[model samples]
Target chain A: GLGPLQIWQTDFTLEPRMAPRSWLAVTVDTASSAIVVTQHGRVTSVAAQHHWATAIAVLGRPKAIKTDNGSCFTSKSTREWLARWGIAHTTGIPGNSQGQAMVERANRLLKDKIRVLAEGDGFMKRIPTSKQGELLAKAMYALNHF
Target chain B: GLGPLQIWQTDFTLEPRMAPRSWLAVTVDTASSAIVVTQHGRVTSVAAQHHWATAIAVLGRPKAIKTDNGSCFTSKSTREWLARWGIAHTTGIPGNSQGQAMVERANRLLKDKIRVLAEGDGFMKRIPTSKQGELLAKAMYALNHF
Candidate 1:
């Protein structure tokens, strides 16, 4: 039977409203729904690797990863890292959003949760720059715990 | 962290072409992507229960299940049965197809695989009634194994 650590999914989403250039690099356990989120000015392969390092340490290494054909995911650096770790990498078909719906749905949930958290912190349509990491951590904790 | 048996999704799809009235009752493990398919003339609650019995025995019992507002899934019998088993049941928003995207994707894969299996059996656009169950079982095995 299928179980956690079987597969993982990662995607990058632009920060809503406040920081258009900022990105949220998100990794989701396809089986367990465990998620990791990192904020970065740019989602380079190094950024993605850092994101994965944290996710793997927390949620355990996955056998395979499904990602979009983004440079951060398909680049030599990221692919080599995954290969070195004995993890298979599968990229989604171009233009087929449904192929990566799992992570896409996670991105949506994280964004909504962040919005509510920011609102509760008295912000309006924006996550404050200084408190971005803290807010993201809180949102992720809430999601994983509840 | 999330794990298999955390949540399952069920949906009904019409059999293609030759058996348009026939239905495919599909239940997918949201976490593991494990699937169960049962073909029926009409997908009533009894049909759904039989489908779940096979799925749970093979894939293990799910803690919760998500389904669209279909009579077979929302019926009093189904609800009571789920409650008795301590499996929480959540229905999708009426108009939002995306809410049940997991099972929708699974249904697509199943239909495509069944098509291939039928074609390999020398059928052009139809699955012979007598070979329907055999073809379905073969298709499911190929999917779960490969």
Candidate 2:
């Protein structure tokens, strides 16, 4: 049971390992309903739960948390930590990677939108606002139309 | 001059007064797209009526008073009160929340964003789920943007 959390589509990435903080951690704020960049490893450290805790939304508490870790392992320390913060935590089963499907679908759109414009340096354009609806129109235009 | 009430958008926003709740009701006429905000401590049909009515009073009657009733029930005052004023009262339809689209379009270019970020010593920093409407304003901002 992947659960309602999956339906709502909330997930976060780890210290997106950069050769120097190159890795990215992404979190979707369920209430705010937008992709917010909460943490990145600067490519310096291994991605982990404590790193996830650094984001405000983790502190703000979403209804649930989804991660790729098979233990990709959801550790005991991680679950208990999320419990105090008022959130349920989940992990992806090995090979049953359905959870990542929605995000995968979105990535395809973004990649298509930016593929022509992307630089090897790797770039993400700024979302004009973090507020919510602004994301949809541009996204809807980019995604919904063609 | 413009057609009477060609469009109006109404919503309530919350804030904090020191240690208490401060609620503000917002309504706007899209032609001028000027917003009128009213301060109230609580929600009521009367309070709701007052907010819309005040926008009308300041901006004068509109051809339509636009609201969201996905709670799926447009209230008496919003409907009946407009009748008294010979103003049309309209709720956002399922399509894009599009009826209120004009005023919605203007909100994004709004520099202040929240009109007011309601905060206090302790307050709910986030709105609820299904809150796709929260973003609805930001999209409106995009739509409103030239």
Over 4 Å off in model 1, which ranges? A1-146, B1-5, B17-21, B93-97
lDDT of each: 0.76, 0.45
Expressed as tens digits, the lDDT of each residue in B61-138 for candidate 1 is 776677777788878899888888877777553222346676888888988898887887789877778788888888
lDDT of 2 by residue, A18-94 (tens): 12333334444332334433333442223445445554433354545655543422556555665666655554333
Interface RMSD of each: 11.7, 22.6
Task: Itemize residue pairs with steric clashes in candidate 1.
Answer: A32-B2
Model 1: how far residue A4 lies from native, Å: 23
Listed models, DockQ each: 0.05, 0.01
Top model number, TM-score? 1
lDDT of 1: 0.76
Q: Which parts of model 2 are misplaced by more than 4 Å?
A: A1-146, B1-5, B17-21, B70-73, B96-146
On lDDT, the candidate that comes out on top is 1
The per-residue C-alpha lDDT of model 1 at residue A56 equals 85
